[PDB]
Symmetry: D2
Subunit: 130 residues, 4 copies
């Protein structure tokens, strides 16, 4: 539903470009993006580092959608890469808040190929609140 | 043009077999909403410089990412000079394992450390 | 005899394509100094249940562990009944990837979540 | 009595600020079915020695595991002597960071590397 325009940003979050926010519920966010040149590596696949940026941004969004408003600072992120996404493809980014304590929040993120429903990558992301 | 453009301002200071050191000044385009080195760019740095260390080996094969983790220990503020140093830990016929430290150039203190497993060939 | 003796008390609930469920009661033998499920036993569980999940396919090849990560979200105390659920995320020719959730049997609440990559052949 | 019984055979070699060194000979007790160091024990060793390195600072606080990762690079065969070297990467206000390298004593080749984040109080 909502278009989001990170391209208007001047800091690093600008690398996401045009993403659409599909839904945002308590502790769950779904976004999509078409993979564009700006997102790719030389081989024309979603760049490992944009994947991480998505894991970082989209999980933060899910924590913004919590009863506590706080984005937190990263402590530990991990990502497993499973299949490539190609220039021109739509990916969907699904972030879940697994647990939110008073000091720590834990999130998970799947990127899936929208066409095949197959996971591109899964990230877990621990953040320190306050 | 593509995502590699975001590394444009890094300078490679040293490369040696299985080991590479780069430096970079943290500028606005590198920052998150709060003015420190974006976590996403730290992972890009981990990915690219680690890959550079692998390329700097006899078999100069870059591999494709399988597993990456990063632990964030201290923030790197806008205008700080960071040092990124990447080491090949082991390189097999199929799998290579690399580690990467990001340090604050002025203090010597770790910003973040990453390990990055890659699949070769 | 060997190290899997530590798994003597885990009950296998079901193995199915892409998913394995075990359960256990944490006894003293399973705990740390603070009387909660020892983090190393959790890691052992993840390693084990995910390898079991890999076997559930025609290529019932166990593979060698490459990278595991575990995030510990809440303690599993002594006397608690716990569920351990491996899912297979992807099984390729050379690499297989699995996720493992440890949950409280009573509440469903998440104790820990692991991901585990293995190198097949 | 509890899970640490499995570390009965580790020897403490030295405990210095920021660095603990331990050793063990890997016995059948410690192996998997392939007769190599069990990946679950390896993870136990990371969790435990890393905690030791913490416990040997002015704040002798063990903390609770938050995130742990391990990458396995070579097997430690039965009858091999191995070294577990934990390093304190940072001790902050509520979060402490540790690294752990398992090596072959004779050759010094990396068996496995872990990082471990613990939460203090």
């Amino acid at each position: 539903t909502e278009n989001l325009y990170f391209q208007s940003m001047r800091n690093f979050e600008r690398v996401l470009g045009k993403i659409t926010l599909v839904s945002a519920a308590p502790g769950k966010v779904i976004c999509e993006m078409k993979v564009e040149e700006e997102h790719t590596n030389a081989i024309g696949t979603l760049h490992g580092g944009l994947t991480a940026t998505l894991v970082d941004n989209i999980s933060t969004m899910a924590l913004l959608c919590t009863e506590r408003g706080a984005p937190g600072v990263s402590v530990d992120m991990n990502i497993t890469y499973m299949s490539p996404a190609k220039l021109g493809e739509d990916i969907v980014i699904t972030a879940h808040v697994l647990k939110q304590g008073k000091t720590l929040a834990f999130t998970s993120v799947d990127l899936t190929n929208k066409a095949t429903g197959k996971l591109i990558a899964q990230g877990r992301h621990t953040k320190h609140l306050g």
